[PDB]
Structures are given as C-alpha cells and as structure tokens.
C-alpha cells in the first residue's frame, strides 16, 4: 500500500493506493466530483503513512523558542 497527499489549490486529499494512475483519477471523481507529480504530468519508502507523497503552500511555523535551541 502507498500513501499519498493529493493537493490542488487550498485543498488536500489524504488517501492510499497502489497499481495505476488510471483508476486513481476516478478516486478523485468519487470525492470532489470531476471527470477522469512535482513538475510533471511511489514506494513503501517514498510515501509512508506518516510521510505521504504529494501529487496553496501550508502556513509557516513560528520561530523556535530560545530555551528550545541547542
């Protein structure tokens, strides 16, 4: 199983799959309603549940407190 974030505009879909891109385009259809990577048009290691692969940017974290620095 392969765990991915599908992101487009300020929305993010969190799901998992395997096989091919074909049925994956329809997975979106049955969620956000539409007809069926990096700068282009996925493994046990490249997309773990806790580290999903991305398929608008998030808010920026605040500065680290001083006591929490090295």
């Amino acid at each position: 199983d392969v765990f991915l974030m599908i992101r487009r505009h300020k929305t993010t879909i969190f799901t998992d799959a395997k096989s091919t891109v074909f049925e994956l385009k329809r997975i979106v259809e049955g969620i956000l309603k539409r007809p069926p990577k990096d700068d282009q048009l996925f493994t046990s290691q490249t997309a773990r549940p806790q580290a999903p692969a991305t398929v608008e940017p998030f808010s920026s974290p605040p500065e680290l407190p001083d006591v929490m620095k090295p």
Binding site: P65, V67, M68, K69
Partner: protein
Amino acid sequence: WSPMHEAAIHGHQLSLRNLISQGWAVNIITADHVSPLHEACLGGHLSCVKILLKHGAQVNGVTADWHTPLFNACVSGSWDCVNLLLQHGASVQPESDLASPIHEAARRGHVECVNSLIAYGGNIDHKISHLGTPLYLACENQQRACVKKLLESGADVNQGKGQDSPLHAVARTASEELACLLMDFGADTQAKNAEGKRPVELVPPESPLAQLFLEREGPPSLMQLCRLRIRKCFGIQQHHKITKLVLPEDLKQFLLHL
C-alpha cells in the same frame, strides 16, 4: 593505631577537635591510604567532615580499594556530606569503574545524592562495562525514586548495560510500576539484547506486563509523541526551562511529568 581515624569512624566531633588542637594531623593516611576524612564520610558524620575540611583535609584522596571521600559519602547516604564535598571540589568523575559515586548512590536509591552529583556536572549516562548506566542499576535494584529522578533529569531511557536496555532489566524484575515509568519516558519496547530477546519475552507468563508491552505495541498518543520530542530539546536538568514557554500550565506539568 590512630586516634584521628578512630574518632572519625564514630563521629566523635569533640574528640576530633581535641585531637586537632593537641597537634594531630588531619591528612594522616593508613597503609591502605585511608584518611580520617574517608571514614567520617563513610559514617555520614557531617560535623566531623566539616571539622576536617576546615583544617585542610584532602577531598580527592584515593584509597587502595579506589574509594574517594565522595564515594564513601554516597555509600552512607548523607546528602549533606555529598553536597559539602562537592562544594570543596570533590571530583565528580572517578578513575575507577569499581567506585563510581553516581552508580553507588543509584543502586542504593540515594536520590538526593544522585541529584547532586548530576547537578555538579556528572555524566548521567556514564556506561560502565559490567554494571551499566546509573539508570540500569537503579532499575535492577528497583529503586523507584532514583529511576524517576534520572529519567526526569534527561537520562537516556534506552542505555543500560551492554545490549540490555533498562526495559529488559525491569522485565526480569517484573516491576509493573517501573515498566510504566520507563515507557512514559520513551523506552523502546522493540529492542533486542545480546540473546536476541525483546523485553516482553522476559516477563512471566502470568503478568499484565505481557499485555502492557503488547496492548501498547501500537503507537503512543500524539501528545506522548510531542512530549518526547520537546523534552529531547533540553539538556540535562534544563527541562525546568519549560516554565518559560508560552503554554497552558496543564501542558507544562505534562511535559515536566508532574
């Protein structure tokens, strides 16, 4: 024979002040290189330690069995003696693996002594081959309050003796109390020792420890995960600085394990 040693053994502070004023030396040692200061510390005789230090006793003398005055004070349990020696520059880090102050205080559950040794710059994680870390010995001897003091201070919950982690020693012991404690500070339940065995495999068939290592075989709560990560940013005995964070008091106490 020696009146000075003899007085120091029994905590006779009047006899000591008498001997000193008649002209007896304070830095007298036996053939074993034991001074009256060593014996005073061994007995936890704070008045006698004060008197000897005032008259120039040496706080870092080493006996033939590798004992220093600080080591003996850690055997006695007198936190006042330990503290007094640390103030006068008693070396925190001994040369012998046979007489480590921080380990002796830890195996005997002398929390306050442990606390002071750490405060004065002792290595909380010092790993002696044939003993382990101070955390490890405290676990072996089921010294609950040393374990909690060491963990709270930032001791590495996973360094024990060789490949045997503290969680292992605790499992053999069957301490349900110490097991929960080590897991709160992030002990690895999936670690294997020199025999390939994991902690759960060393606990009696009839214990709730087995269910504890296995029911919590899943992942910790995200709050637990955040706590481990945040505490990992502070150095030894710096975690109090969590006070200075802009955070609800409930969470500061959670991070401080209070």
